[PDB]
Design a protein around this ligand. Structure first.
Ligand SMILES: Nc1ncnc2c1ncn2[C@@H]1O[C@H](COP(=O)(O)OP(=O)(O)O)[C@@H](O)[C@H]1O
Lengths: 50, 106, 116, 450, 62, 175, 230, 70, 167, 77, 126
């Protein structure tokens, strides 16, 4: 093979990033925090429901 | 015989490495001639003779005194007649397997 | 006679086995009888970890060591079926012809890499 | 040293609190506080799972003695608990809770994020946390409850795949990390995955040996990396490091020894542990192909990372700042006390390495010898996998040969790959060709000629 | 050195150094030849008996 | 050395002047600190835009490693045969025998010791003598493997006996 | 700026002699166990036979370079030598000649040639061909300009260590941009693009042939400054 | 880091060095050792150890675990 | 940068600028005749071994001429095979240090003999080979101080400092 | 480079470095004449359309030489 | 002394790119020559961060890339701000930087929001 797709820094960055598992989990946790604590709990829970 | 030691294993490995280096020098430089072939054969023969020599030297020097002492101890314990009868080809290996060693505590 | 049988061929009671502090792994196996004398000799004859890992004939505990070695070889060959395994590995054609083990030969595929 | 289920929970809580406080070394820095909070959340989740499992066990038996529970875990195997609309087996739920709690502590897929981010702690703190304790909690917890984990179908399917995947991921991540702390953490994650896979094998001795060897070697490597970072002014990335071998000979030699031992390299305790782990694999797994692939991939990845770290820190180009080297390169500092590290640290490292080697030798003598000197493992399920260690066939020999051949191919590739142009690039090719030819000649002569 | 099974796996089981007792020369004559033949037959029969025992010694423990 | 360096400047902990209103809509979403306050979570992979885009990119890149794993698995499966592993065959009454004994005991279906007429079934965690699920299938598979290994050993012994008898007969047949 | 003379117990230079095994230093003294001292002391080396063997073995004096300008032998009658490989070409030929022995030697010496193939196939496909095999394939060992056919006679290496010379149209030669041939041959240029000058690569357009010259190759000014080569 | 002034009024433990550390260490080691000995005695008062090697538990002794008699 | 080969000649009256004092003789036989030169050659056998087995391109210069008319060097070095004369482009020779020469060989060379002036390595980049003179030698002050050998005519910063680099 | 071997046949680098020497290299598989380079029948177009002057002339001369050889062999048929 | 809040604040990818190229999330506030100089300096730093320091360096390749970048930057600087070629060159340099976007970039302690920053609490004379 004359060209290796695994030789580019993009592949290197993706591998060193742990397959972006940290990014995915952090985005999901941020979405949960935004939707639950502020929106669902404090706003819909305390301001509205309570 | 005693087990082969670091010296013997290293001698064998060094002979193999010297042969490998000579073969690399030959093939890489394409220096293959009748004189080189004869020298390689002679080196292989000398290495084999020397490898047989260390085993002979070790075996002789170690075992021969130890073997003589062990035989002398067993000669007084069992007997030259028993030893010769064991050496006689007329002995039966079936009974020899069932024979008890008087110096075996078990 | 038996490979697992000790030189004196005596059976050790559960109380004696627990008194011998034999490992549960050894107790699981069928070679307890020979391991009892070897364990007794080793406890009675202390040897360092370097000594035991370095001694080839196990020092004084020699006959018990040989008996335990035979018993353990038999146990490990039977539990791994390594006998028929090596037999079929030596010659797949001969094992299939002789019908040594129908179950072993029926799924015997040496593999292309391992000399086809 | 837990003796009761309350003691285990107290120990887990204490370990969590100690990790939370230790990670917060620079309390004035709020950046590390985020990692500390993430670690605290993970520990709290693990503690909650453990508390739920302990509550279920107590509701089942009303006995907090761990020894009695292990001696009585086989009693209620044929039972179920009506949770919501489902009815799962009694052992299944407790085993799942214990396995999840261990995976939270012993870094696994989805729960290993806090392990890499935990590098904000000091060098000795990271050495202690990563090598054992926080990393060894899961293995110790699983081993303590060995009989309970024996009869769990969920554990049976979960442990092998999870362990292999985690080991492979950790190895691949360590193969791409330039930061010494990050590379070490990823290698530790790979080692934890391998230890979990070994726990799935059902043989405790291999797990214990792997734990001891991995902990000792990781501690040594972490100490060396911390010393290098201290010389580099708290810089952990190897991309801005180079030429430190001349600055720190002791550190270079210790790092070489530690990387040789830890990376699973052939002809060492790591090689023995890898062979033992590969011996005891069972072939009844539904996902056997992926499991085997992940195990091989995670086994092969350590050497590349170790060699890369060693060469970059010690024998690469001067990628470090001119200040780091030149400031200590002044002629005035030349005296009988010149040293880039501390003599006390170097002596501690040497003594720890010697003691670890002696202890590993003693453990191998007690376990790996012909006579099993191990005490009773309190396990009633003994596999026949020890037969292969005592007497295997030529098939396992050829498999191990294939693995060693992959390792040798990787070593050759890392030895001669010309990633950059050089004055000896052609000379490197000539050297590699000469090595191949000499190796072929030696293989021919040593086995057939003599 | 003490664990060359790793070398026996990847590089195979190479040629070992010449290990022999060479002690049968203690005596001389056709008796020595008969003893050597008996020893060779004993080694072959030991291999055969080991095969037979390892094949039949599976039912010793029940 | 060589320069009387002053005390550590107070600028090492600069004071942050909040230029934007910390709206209650982001309560606890930013870690507040008098020097260098930060966001609650860190996304060092900001090159990836969104969680869906990041997941798509990660799944696209992981295909090469998945294919490498598949190649390794194929190279192993096309060059190896199934091994002979299982529970210790000499011990059938341990982890294996105890399971069948407990399944044949069913002591959790007996009457109360004091005549309370309440059995193990009268519980949220109630005994069930006919589960036949979970680890029971794995136990059955292990028992089948042990039986197959024992049958293989017995067949090997029988075949060796047959070979020895045939050799004896052929040696006797020649006369 | 050392102050070692001020203090007595300070480490001395004579003490720092064990560091020579790892730190390169200019020669200060020759050791008793030094190879040079062993050679210059033993009267066995003073024998005439040893000197004769030393003068008449190993490398010969004839093949050693003696000028900054060299002229290789003539491939044809009216051709003009332009470029020639000096050491890289020899090393490539030696590497390609390894398969002339190892492939038969392994075939006659490996218990599992099938295993050897199953191992080496990815090594060639993923690691070796892009490193050595394809580099030697694109390597131009010798290049001369035949004026009669107005062509280029180029001799290059072949898989089993062979030599092969072909004539290509000068009008079919085009300058290959490294950027134009960067990505499609990335790994080839990454792992083994070090030995050839990416700033000077030619291409015969007739069959899509890529011609690469060594960065350390020897170029003749007379051939370069010819009407055929502009 | 280069040491910087700290408030003398602040009860901080930042790089605090005591000249009389030897006597304080000796005093905090000795009574602690005595307390540790007392606690060790208290803990060893109630201990359980596995039976000695070569000693088998005869089931007729009360030391063997008992069953609740209905 | 480019290895363009151009034919050169000899001035026919080259100025002898340096001749090794110890290595005085017609060739190998003459050196064998002299006892001290024989010991020096025995020490230089490690240099020959390094050049051949360790693949170190290097020459032990024993004599030299300079042809400023052809801008050429006419050195005459010694090796295990005998005396070899070398013609070098004056633009193809550059100074180099002992550490650079030693590290030029990736393998570890043998113990050095004292007969080498470590500070005066001379690299022929066109041939890419190092050269070391003899410590015991006579150098012509006028021969070296000719206008052709001036650093202004020879020393180029790029070739001198960065052409030979090992990473 | 060689042990216990004579380098009598090897060409001296002193002779090699001289411009205008009578050194000629004979290499294996060296095609010094493109006789078959431009030989092609059943062309989709004309030979002049497919081939240029040089190749066309070389191929024409090769065909003429082949025909001459065949005719010379035909005198003893 | 740049505030290394690249991964410390919830900034978008465009914000990160703007901070990398011109140092400001609103590079439109920068002038023509100022923006060109900032882009050239950032590109040089990022190139040295991958070709002068990294896994395996090549000095000649680094020098060649530096010469090419210098030629491009001179062309951009001598061009008009309201030129398609200048905007294209700016886009090319930004895309080159984005391709070199390393999440685990080395942050020097001299940065305001650095990893080693905030290690100690300095007490004032008050
Ligand atoms: N209270 C807040 N509300 C909204 N955004 C904020 C707040 N505090 C910080 N940020 C974000 O954090 C980043 C850091 O801002 P800062 O560095 O203080 O401003 P500047 O860059 O002008 O000095 C800003 O881009 C801003 O978007």
């Amino acid at each position: 093979m004359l060209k290796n797709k695994l030789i580019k820094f993009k592949f290197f960055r993706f591998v060193q990033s742990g397959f972006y598992v940290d990014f995915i989990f952090k985005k999901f946790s941020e979405m949960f925090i935004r939707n639950i604590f502020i929106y669902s709990s404090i706003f819909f829970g305390e301001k509205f429901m309570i | 015989p005693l087990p082969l030691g670091i010296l013997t294993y290293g001698l064998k490995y060094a002979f193999a490495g010297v042969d490998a280096a000579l073969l690399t020098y030959f093939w890489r430089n394409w220096n293959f001639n009748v004189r080189t072939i004869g020298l390689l054969g002679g080196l292989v023969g000398i290495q084999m003779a020397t490898l047989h020599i260390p085993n002979l030297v070790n075996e002789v020097v170690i075992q021969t005194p130890r073997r003589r002492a062990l035989a002398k101890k067993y000669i007084s314990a069992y007997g030259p007649q028993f030893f010769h009868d064991i050496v006689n080809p007329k002995y039966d290996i079936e009974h020899l397997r069932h024979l008890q060693n008087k110096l075996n505590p078990y | 006679g038996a490979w697992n049988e000790n030189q004196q061929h005596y059976k050790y009671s559960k109380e004696e086995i627990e008194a011998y502090q034999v490992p549960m792994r050894i107790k699981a196996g069928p070679c307890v009888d020979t391991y009892i004398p070897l364990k007794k000799c080793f406890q009675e004859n202390p040897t360092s970890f370097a000594a035991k890992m370095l001694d080839g004939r196990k020092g004084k505990c020699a006959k018990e060591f040989k008996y335990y070695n035979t018993c353990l070889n038999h146990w490990q060959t039977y539990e791994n079926n390594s006998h028929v395994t090596n037999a079929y590995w030596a010659d797949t054609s001969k094992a299939n012809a002789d019908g040594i083990s129908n179950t072993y030969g029926g799924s015997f595929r040496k593999g292309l890499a391992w000399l086809n | 040293s837990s003796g009761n289920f309350i003691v285990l929970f107290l120990g887990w809580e204490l370990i969590g609190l100690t990790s939370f406080f230790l990670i917060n070394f620079w309390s004035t820095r709020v950046g590390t506080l985020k990692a500390a909070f993430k670690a605290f959340s993970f520990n709290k989740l693990s503690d909650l799972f453990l508390f739920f499992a302990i509550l279920i066990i107590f509701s089942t038996t009303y006995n907090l003695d761990i020894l009695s529970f292990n001696n009585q875990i086989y009693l209620y195997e044929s039972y179920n608990i009506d949770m919501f609309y489902w009815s799962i087996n009694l052992i299944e739920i407790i085993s799942f809770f214990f396995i999840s709690c261990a995976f939270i502590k012993s870094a696994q897929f989805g729960a290993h994020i806090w392990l890499p981010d935990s590098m904000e702690a000091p060098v000795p703190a990271s050495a202690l946390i990563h090598s054992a304790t926080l990393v060894s909690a899961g293995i110790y917890l699983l081993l303590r409850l060995s009989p309970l984990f024996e009869l769990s179908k969920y554990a049976y399917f979960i442990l092998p795949l999870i362990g292999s995947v985690t080991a492979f991921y950790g190895g691949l991540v360590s193969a791409f990390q330039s930061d010494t702390k990050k590379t070490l953490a990823y290698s530790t994650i790979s080692h934890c995955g391998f230890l979990m896979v070994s726990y799935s094998t059902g043989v405790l001795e291999f797990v214990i040996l792997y734990l001891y060897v991995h902990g000792f070697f990781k501690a040594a490597t972490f100490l060396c990396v911390g010393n290098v970072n201290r010389f580099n002014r708290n810089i952990q990335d190897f991309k801005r490091m180079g030429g430190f071998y001349k600055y720190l000979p002791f550190e270079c030699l210790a790092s070489f020894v530690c990387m040789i031992n830890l990376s699973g390299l052939p002809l060492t305790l790591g090689f023995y542990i890898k062979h033992l782990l590969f011996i005891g694999l069972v072939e009844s797994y539904t996902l056997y192909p992926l499991i085997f692939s992940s195990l091989i991939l995670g086994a092969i990845a350590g050497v590349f990372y170790s060699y890369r770290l060693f060469y970059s820190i010690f024998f690469d180009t001067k990628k470090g700042k001119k200040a780091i080297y030149l400031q200590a390169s002044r002629i005035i500092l030349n005296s009988k006390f010149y040293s880039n590290t501390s003599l006390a640290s170097n002596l501690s490292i040497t003594f720890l390495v010697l003691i670890s080697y002696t202890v590993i030798l003693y453990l191998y003598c007690t376990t790996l010898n012909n006579y099993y000197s191990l005490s009773d493992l309190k396990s009633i399920y003994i596999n026949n996998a020890y037969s292969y260690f005592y007497k295997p066939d030529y098939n396992f020999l050829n498999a191990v040969s294939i693995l060693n051949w992959f390792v040798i191919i990787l070593l050759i590739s890392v030895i001669y790959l010309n990633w950059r142009w050089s004055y000896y690039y052609t000379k490197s090719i000539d050297s590699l060709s000469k090595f191949i030819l000499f190796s072929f000649f030696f293989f021919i002569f040593s086995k057939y000629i003599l | 050195y003490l664990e060359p099974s790793y070398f026996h796996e990847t590089f195979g089981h190479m040629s070992q150094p010449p290990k022999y007792d060479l002690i049968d020369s203690n005596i001389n004559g056709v008796e020595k030849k008969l003893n050597k033949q008996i020893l060779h037959r004993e080694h072959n029969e030991h291999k055969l008996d080991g095969f037979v025992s390892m094949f039949k010694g599976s039912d010793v423990a029940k | 050395h060589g320069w009387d360096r002053p005390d550590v400047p107070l600028s090492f902990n600069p004071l942050y002047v909040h230029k934007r209103e910390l709206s209650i809509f982001d309560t606890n979403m930013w870690m507040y600190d008098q020097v260098y306050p930060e966001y609650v979570i860190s996304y060092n992979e900001i090159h990836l835009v969104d969680q869906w885009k990041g997941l798509k990119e990660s799944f696209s890149q992981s295909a090469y490693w998945w294919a490498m794993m598949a190649m390794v698995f194929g190279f192993y499966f096309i060059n190896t045969t199934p091994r002979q592993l299982g529970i210790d065959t000499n011990d059938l009454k341990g982890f294996l025998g105890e399971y069948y004994g407990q399944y044949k005991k069913r002591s959790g279906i007996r009457s109360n010791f004091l005549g309370l007429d309440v059995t193990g079934e009268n519980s949220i965690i109630q005994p069930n003598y006919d589960r036949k699920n979970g680890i029971r299938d794995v136990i059955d598979s292990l028992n089948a493997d042990a039986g197959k290994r024992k049958l293989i050993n017995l067949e090997a012994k029988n075949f060796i006996e047959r070979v020895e008898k045939e050799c004896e007969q052929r040696i006797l047949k020649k006369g | 700026g050392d102050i070692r003379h001020k203090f007595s117990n300070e480490i001395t230079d004579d003490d720092y002699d064990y560091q020579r095994a790892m730190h390169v230093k200019p020669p200060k003294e020759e050791s008793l166990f030094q190879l040079t001292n062993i050679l210059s002391s033993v009267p066995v080396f003073k024998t005439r036979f040893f000197l004769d063997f030393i003068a008449r073995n190993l490398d010969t004096n004839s093949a050693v370079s003696t000028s900054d300008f060299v002229a290789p032998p003539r491939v044809h009658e009216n051709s003009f030598f332009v470029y020639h490989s000096r050491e890289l070409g020899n090393v490539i030929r030696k590497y390609r000649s390894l398969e002339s022995i190892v492939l038969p030697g392994a075939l006659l010496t490996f218990t599992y040639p099938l295993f050897a193939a199953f191992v080496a196939i990815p090594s060639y496909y993923f690691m070796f061909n892009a490193k050595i095999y394809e580099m030697s394939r694109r390597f131009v060992v010798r290049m001369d300009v035949l004026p009669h056919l107005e062509m280029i006679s180029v001799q290059r290496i072949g898989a089993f260590g062979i030599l092969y010379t072909k004539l290509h149209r000068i009008q079919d030669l085009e300058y290959v941009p490294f950027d134009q041939v960067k990505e499609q041959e990335n790994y080839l240029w990454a792992i083994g693009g070090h030995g050839v000058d990416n700033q000077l690569i030619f291409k015969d357009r007739s069959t899509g042939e890529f011609f690469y010259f060594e960065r350390q190759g020897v170029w003749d000014a007379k051939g370069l400054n010819h009407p055929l080569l502009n | 880091f280069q040491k910087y002034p700290i408030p003398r009024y602040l009860h901080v433990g930042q790089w605090i060095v005591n000249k009389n550390w030897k006597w304080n260490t000796f005093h905090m080691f000795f009574p602690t050792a005595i307390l540790c000995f007392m606690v060790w005695r208290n803990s060893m008062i109630s201990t359980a150890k596995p039976p000695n090697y070569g000693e088998y538990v005869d089931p007729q002794s009360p030391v063997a675990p008992k069953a609740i008699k209905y | 940068y480019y290895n363009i080969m151009r034919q050169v000649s000899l001035d026919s009256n080259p100025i002898v600028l340096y001749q090794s004092s110890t290595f005085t003789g017609n060739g190998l036989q003459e050196f064998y005749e002299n006892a001290d030169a024989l010991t020096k050659y025995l020490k230089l056998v490690p240099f020959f071994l390094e050049k051949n087995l360790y693949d170190h391109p290097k020459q032990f210069v024993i004599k030299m001429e300079f042809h400023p008319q052809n801008k050429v060097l006419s050195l005459d070095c010694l090796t295990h095979q005998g005396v070899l004369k070398k013609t070098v482009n004056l633009e193809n020779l550059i100074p180099v240090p002992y550490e650079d020469y030693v590290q030029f060989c990736r393998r570890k060379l043998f113990n050095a003999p004292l007969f080498l002036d470590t500070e005066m390595i001379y690299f022929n980049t066109f041939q890419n080979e190092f050269y070391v003179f003899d410590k015991n030698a006579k150098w012509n002050e006028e021969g070296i101080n000719h206008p052709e050998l001036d650093i202004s005519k020879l020393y180029n910063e790029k070739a001198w400092f960065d052409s030979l680099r090992i990473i | 480079s060689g042990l216990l071997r004579n380098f009598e046949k090897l060409v001296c680098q002193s002779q090699l470095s001289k411009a205008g020497h009578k050194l000629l290299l004979r290499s294996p598989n060296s095609t010094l004449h493109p006789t078959a380079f431009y030989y092609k029948r059943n062309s989709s177009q004309r030979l002049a359309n497919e081939m240029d002057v040089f190749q066309l002339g070389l191929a024409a001369a090769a065909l003429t030489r082949q025909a001459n050889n065949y005719a010379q062999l035909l005198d003893q048929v | 002394m740049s505030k290394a809040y690249y991964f410390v604040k919830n900034f978008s990818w465009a914000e990160v790119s703007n901070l990398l190229c011109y140092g400001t999330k609103y590079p439109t506030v920068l002038n023509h020559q100022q923006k060109v100089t900032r882009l050239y300096r950032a590109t040089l730093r990022r190139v040295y961060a991958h070709q002068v320091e990294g896994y395996k360096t090549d000095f000649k390749q680094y020098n060649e890339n530096i010469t090419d970048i210098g030629k491009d930057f001179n062309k951009m600087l001598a061009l008009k701000p309201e030129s398609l070629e200048l905007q294209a060159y700016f886009k090319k340099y930004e895309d080159l930087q984005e391709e070199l976007f390393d999440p685990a970039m080395i942050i020097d302690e001299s940065r305001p929001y650095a990893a080693s920053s905030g290690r100690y609490y300095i007490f004032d004379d008050y």
